[PDB]
Amino acid sequence: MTDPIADFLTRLRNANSAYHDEVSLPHSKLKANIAQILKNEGYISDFRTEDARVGKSLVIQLKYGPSRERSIAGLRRVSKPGLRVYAKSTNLPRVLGGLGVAIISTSSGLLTDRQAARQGVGGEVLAYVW
Amino acid sequence: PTIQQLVRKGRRDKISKVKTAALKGSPQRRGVCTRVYTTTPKKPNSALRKVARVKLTSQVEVTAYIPGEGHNLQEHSMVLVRGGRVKDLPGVRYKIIRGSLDTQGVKNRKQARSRYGAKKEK
RNA sequence: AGAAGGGGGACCGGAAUAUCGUGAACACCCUUGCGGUGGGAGCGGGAUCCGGUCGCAGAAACCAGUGAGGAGCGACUGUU
RNA sequence: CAGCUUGUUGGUGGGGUGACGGCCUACCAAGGCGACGACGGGUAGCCGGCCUGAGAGGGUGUCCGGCCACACUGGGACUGAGAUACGGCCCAGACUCCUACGGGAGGCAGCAGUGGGGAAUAUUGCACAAUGGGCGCAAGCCUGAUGCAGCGACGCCGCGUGGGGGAUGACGGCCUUCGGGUUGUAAACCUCUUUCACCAUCGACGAAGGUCCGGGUUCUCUCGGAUUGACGGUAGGUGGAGAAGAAGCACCGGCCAACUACGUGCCAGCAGCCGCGGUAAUACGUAGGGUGCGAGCGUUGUCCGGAAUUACUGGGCGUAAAGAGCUCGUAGGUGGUUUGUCGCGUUGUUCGUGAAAUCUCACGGCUUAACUGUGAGCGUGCGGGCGAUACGGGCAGACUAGAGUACUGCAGGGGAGACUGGAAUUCCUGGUGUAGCGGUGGAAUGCGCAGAUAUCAGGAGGAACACCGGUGGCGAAGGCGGGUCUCUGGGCAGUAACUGACGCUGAGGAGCGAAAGCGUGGGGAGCGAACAGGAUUAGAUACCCUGGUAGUCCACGCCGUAAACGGUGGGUACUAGGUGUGGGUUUCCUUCCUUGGGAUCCGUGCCGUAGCUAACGCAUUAAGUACCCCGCCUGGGGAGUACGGCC
RNA sequence: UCGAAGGUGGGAUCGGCGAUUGGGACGAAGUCGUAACAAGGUAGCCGUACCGGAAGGUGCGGCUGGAUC
Numbered sequence A: 001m002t003d004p005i006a007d008f009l010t011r012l013r014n015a016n017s018a019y020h021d022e023v024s025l026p027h028s029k030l031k032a033n034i035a036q037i038l039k040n041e042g043y044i045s046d047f048r049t050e051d052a053r054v055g056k057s058l059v060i061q062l063k064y065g066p067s068r069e070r071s072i073a074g075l076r077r078v079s080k081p082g083l084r085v086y087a088k089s090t091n092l093p094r095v096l097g098g099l100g101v102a103i104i105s106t107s108s109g110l111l112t113d114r115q116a117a118r119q120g121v122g123g124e125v126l127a128y129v130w
Numbered sequence B: 001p002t003i004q005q006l007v008r009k010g011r012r013d014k015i016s017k018v019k020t021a022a023l024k025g026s027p028q029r030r031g032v033c034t035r036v037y038t039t040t041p042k043k044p045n046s047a048l049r050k051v052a053r054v055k056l057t058s059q060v061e062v063t064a065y066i067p068g069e070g071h072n073l074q075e076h077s078m079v080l081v082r083g084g085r086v087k088d089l090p091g092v093r094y095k096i097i098r099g100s101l102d103t104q105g106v107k108n109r110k111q112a113r114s115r116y117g118a119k120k121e122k
Numbered sequence C: 001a002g003a004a005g006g007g008g009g010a011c012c013g014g015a016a017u018a019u020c021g022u023g024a025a026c027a028c029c030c031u032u033g034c035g036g037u038g039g040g041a042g043c044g045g046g047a048u049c050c051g052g053u054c055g056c057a058g059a060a061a062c063c064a065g066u067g068a069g070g071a072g073c074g075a076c077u078g079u080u
Numbered sequence D: 001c002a003g004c005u006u007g008u009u010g011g012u013g014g015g016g017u018g019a020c021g022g023c024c025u026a027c028c029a030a031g032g033c034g035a036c037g038a039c040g041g042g043u044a045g046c047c048g049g050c051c052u053g054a055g056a057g058g059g060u061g062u063c064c065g066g067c068c069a070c071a072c073u074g075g076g077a078c079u080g081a082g083a084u085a086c087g088g089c090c091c092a093g094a095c096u097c098c099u100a101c102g103g104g105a106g107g108c109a110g111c112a113g114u115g116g117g118g119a120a121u122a123u124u125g126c127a128c129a130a131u132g133g134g135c136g137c138a139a140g141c142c143u144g145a146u147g148c149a150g151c152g153a154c155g156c157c158g159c160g161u162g163g164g165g166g167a168u169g170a171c172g173g174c175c176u177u178c179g180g181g182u183u184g185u186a187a188a189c190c191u192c193u194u195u196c197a198c199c200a201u202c203g204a205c206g207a208a209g210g211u212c213c214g215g216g217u218u219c220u221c222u223c224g225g226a227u228u229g230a231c232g233g234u235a236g237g238u239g240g241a242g243a244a245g246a247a248g249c250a251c252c253g254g255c256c257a258a259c260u261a262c263g264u265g266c267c268a269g270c271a272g273c274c275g276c277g278g279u280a281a282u283a284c285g286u287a288g289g290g291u292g293c294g295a296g297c298g299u300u301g302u303c304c305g306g307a308a309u310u311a312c313u314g315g316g317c318g319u320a321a322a323g324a325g326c327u328c329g330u331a332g333g334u335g336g337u338u339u340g341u342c343g344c345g346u347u348g349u350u351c352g353u354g355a356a357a358u359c360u361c362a363c364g365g366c367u368u369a370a371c372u373g374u375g376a377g378c379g380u381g382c383g384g385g386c387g388a389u390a391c392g393g394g395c396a397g398a399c400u401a402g403a404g405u406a407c408u409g410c411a412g413g414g415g416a417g418a419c420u421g422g423a424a425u426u427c428c429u430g431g432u433g434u435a436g437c438g439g440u441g442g443a444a445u446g447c448g449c450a451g452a453u454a455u456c457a458g459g460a461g462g463a464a465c466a467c468c469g470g471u472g473g474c475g476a477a478g479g480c481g482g483g484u485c486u487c488u489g490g491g492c493a494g495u496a497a498c499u500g501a502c503g504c505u506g507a508g509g510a511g512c513g514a515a516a517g518c519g520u521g522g523g524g525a526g527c528g529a530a531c532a533g534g535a536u537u538a539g540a541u542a543c544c545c546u547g548g549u550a551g552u553c554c555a556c557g558c559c560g561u562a563a564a565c566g567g568u569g570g571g572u573a574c575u576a577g578g579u580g581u582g583g584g585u586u587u588c589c590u591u592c593c594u595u596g597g598g599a600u601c602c603g604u605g606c607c608g609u610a611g612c613u614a615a616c617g618c619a620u621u622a623a624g625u626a627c628c629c630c631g632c633c634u635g636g637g638g639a640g641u642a643c644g645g646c647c
Numbered sequence E: 001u002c003g004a005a006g007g008u009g010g011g012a013u014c015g016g017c018g019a020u021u022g023g024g025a026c027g028a029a030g031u032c033g034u035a036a037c038a039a040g041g042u043a044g045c046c047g048u049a050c051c052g053g054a055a056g057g058u059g060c061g062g063c064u065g066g067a068u069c
Ligand SMILES: [Mg+2]
Pocket: B001, D311
C-alpha cells in the first residue's frame, strides 16, 4: 500500500469507468484537500468524512451529465514516489492547453495551475485531473 | 521503466560498425591495383563484373569495382579508390574512380558526363 | 623451492652503568624451613644503529648445493 | 581490471616555502583509500563555442576568445618582482656539420620557404600608415604582434551572361497514326540599356594624428606654413562605341520533379533498397524532349534526423526478442494514520556572480546582403540575506488499520527416521505330466524333450504400493498416498488478548532444487541404454522379436541442469455477474432434517460485464485500471560458441 | 645523500607469423540417405547418457506447442 494519492486516483478512475455512484476509502487530510480542490473545480459533487470502525473514511460522490456521460475525462498521478515532480512559477505545467487542472502543492497550500500562476509560487505537481 | 533501475544502469546506444575500414579516414585512398581480372556476380545476375585487387597507402587489400564500358587497367597501376556498394558481388565495397591519376575517363560518354570520366568537348 | 635472481658480512669506538635478554651474591618477611618477596653485585650471551681504521681480498685457512629447459621409462622410499 | 597504499594516514619536535601542508627529516600510533568502482587498461587538451535535432537530446572542440600543457628526447639549477625560460644556461642520448683528431657548433610545435607522407590545403611580398608592447627628459629606435597585399569556387552573400514585337508556325532535328506536333517568341528582322568587363581622367574616409614655427612662456586649446597611407592611384566617381565580352551542371521506375525512339539482346551494363537487362528497356550506351539548380552541379568521407530501432520526455517482456528453476536475505530503493518542532529538499524576493564575440528581438552603417556597431534577452547555474511549511525529509511524540505475537479450533499424499503387511513377477525344491512353449502383421532367433509350458505346495529375494484415487488435498519450487509409531514444518478459521510501522522488494551472496550422470560400500526381482542374434528392407548401425550390461534401489557425498510452463516476477488497492469443489465461522429459514439455503474469510475450476490485445485470448486466480522493488530485449545466423575467468 | 641515462634478471601485458589441425558462412546444375512439416509412416520437443557413415536411434524423467476412449 504505497502512494495513497495514487490509490485514491485509481479508485476514482475505476469507479468512474464502472459508472459507480459512490466510493469509499480511508480518510486523510491530503485526500480531503484534494477532494476540496476537485469540488471547487467542479469535476465532482459533494464529499464528506465519516468515522469508520478504525480511523476515518472519506466519502466522495461523483457527478454525471445528462446521458451516461462522465464529467471526469481521466486521471493521472504526476509526482510518483519513484521520481518526484517539482515545478516553478515560470514553467508551471499546462493540462489540455488550459482545459485541464493540475494540483500544485505550494507554501500557500494545495492550489490549481491558474491560481498558483496568479500568486507566483510553485511546488509539487500532485496529479492531472483534466 | 523503473527509474531507479535506470539510474543504476543507464541506457546504451547501439553498437556501430564502420564502413570505411580500408580507407581508414580518407574519402579517397591511393592504391596499387594489382591483378585486374573479372568475376561472376550472384546467381540472378549472370554477368562479368570487372574487378581488381588494389592495396591502398593504408596497406589493406580489398577488391574494388570498375564502372564504365571497358577499361585500360593492367598490373599495378596508379589509381584512386572511393567507396560504394555493388549489391551483386559477394564482398566488393569500394569503387575505382575513373578519370584519375592513371585510368582514363570512359570514352564515348555523353550522359552524366562526370562519372566514369568525360570532358564536355575540346 | 635452497626455484631462479639479488643485498650485507673484518677490526676499533660509542649508543651501553639492566641497552636487551640468562641465571641471582650482599642485603629485605613469615606458618623457622632444603621457606617466600623485593633487590641488584659479580659472571657469561646475542643483536642492531652511528662513527672511524686496514688490506688486492673480511664466508677469511680447513670446511662447504652448479643452475635452467624439452622428451622416454618406471608413480614414489626400497631390492637385485 | 576486486583489494589498493607505507611518507602511505595521523600526531609530535625540528627543517623548508612568499604561504598552509609528509614538502623534507627523527620518534609514536595503525591506520588511510575501495562496489557511490579505488587500483589497473584503452582513449582524450578543457570551456565559451560549432553542427543536427521542434525540444529533450546526439555529434564536435577547427576560425576567434579564456585557460592549460609542450619547445629534438630526458633530467636540473641560476638570474630575476615574476621562468614549460621556443629564438637563455648545465648534463645524458640520437641526428647533422667543421677539424690540424686535440677539439667545437646546432635545433622553424615564430613569419616566409624546402625535403618526405598523404586525396589534399598558400608568398622565402609591403609598412610600422593606425593599435598594443619595450627602452628616454626626449626627439626617436624595434616589433613576420599588427595593418594589408598575393594564391585557391575552399564557404556565405550579391550582380550579370540582356530586354521590348516573333507562329518565317526558320531550315533542320526529334517523335510520327504520314495528318501533324515538340524544340519555340527564344530566333532572323526593327529596336532600348550599357550592371559587371575594355580604355582615359579625378580620386578617397580611414589621420579632432606626429613632428619642425605663430598665441601659448611648459602644463590646456584650436589656427594655418611643410610633411607623413603599405593598402593605393585602390575603393569610389566621371567620360566613350557597342548586346556587343561572357553557362554550365545533375536527374527523369517507386521513394522523388522530370518519356519517346535508336543499338543491344543475362551480353554489353546501371544501381542507395527492390529490381531492370535471356529480341518492342520511360531503369543499359546514345538522340530528342522534360525536371531542378546554377558559376556551380553530382560522387565519396563523417555526424545529426527520419529511428518512438536504448523509449525522462518517448518502448516492451502469455504465443513475435525478452520473468532468474524456487526461496531466503546484505547493501540499496520505497513506505500506514496523526501531533509538534526545524526548514535540508521545495519555492518566492533581493544582492553578487554567471567575460566578450557568437544564438534571438529591436534598431544603425557598408548601394543591398554577407559583414559590423548599440540597446535588451541568453548565460537553464552558483554563493548571501530576508519570507512558507502545502509535500518529501531530520528530530521528539501518539494510534491501530499494515505487520508481527497471543489463545481456541480446523484440514492435509508437507517432511525425516524406525518397524511392519498383502497382491504380483522371477527364482529354488518337490509332486502331477508329456511334446511342445514363447513371439508377430507373418516369422525366426530363443527355451524343452537330459522332462519344458501348464498345475499344486513350500521357501528365497528385490522393486512398487491396485481398490480408496478425483476435476481432490498439501508444499516456495522441484514434488508428495500400503499400514503403525516417534520427531518436526507450514497454512486456514475464530477472539481481539498483546507490540506498535517493527512493512515491500532485493544488486551481489546464500540455501533448496525432476530425470540422466559421477565417487565409495551394499543390493539387483522386473525393466532396460550399450552390445548380440533374429526379422523388415536395395541397405536397417532403427521401428518388431529373443536376450542382455551399466542404470533404475539403499547409505553418504558430488553435479545444479529440464517445455524446472500458467511459456504470465513479488506486494497492495479498485473494477458486473453466473455456476462446481475444498477448509472454517456465523445468525436466520432451525426442522423448511436440510445437513439444504443466506452472510463472511481463505483457495481451487469453468463460463461470462467493462476494459486490454495484432489476433488468439485474459477477464477478481487479469494479459483491466495504478503504485514500489528486482530481472530481461534491441534483426536472423555465426552462438549461448571462441578467448579469459569461477566452480 | 638524491639523482637522468645505461647494464644485469625474473616476471606482467598486448600483437604478428607458424608445420599441422577443428568448427563456421557462401557457392553448381555432384555423391549417400529421408531426420522434420499429415498420425510425415516409429508424434514432436526439452536435460542427460550411450551408440552409429551422416542426418539420427535408444533409455530415463518432463510438456502439449497432438490424438484417443
Ligand atoms: Mg520509458
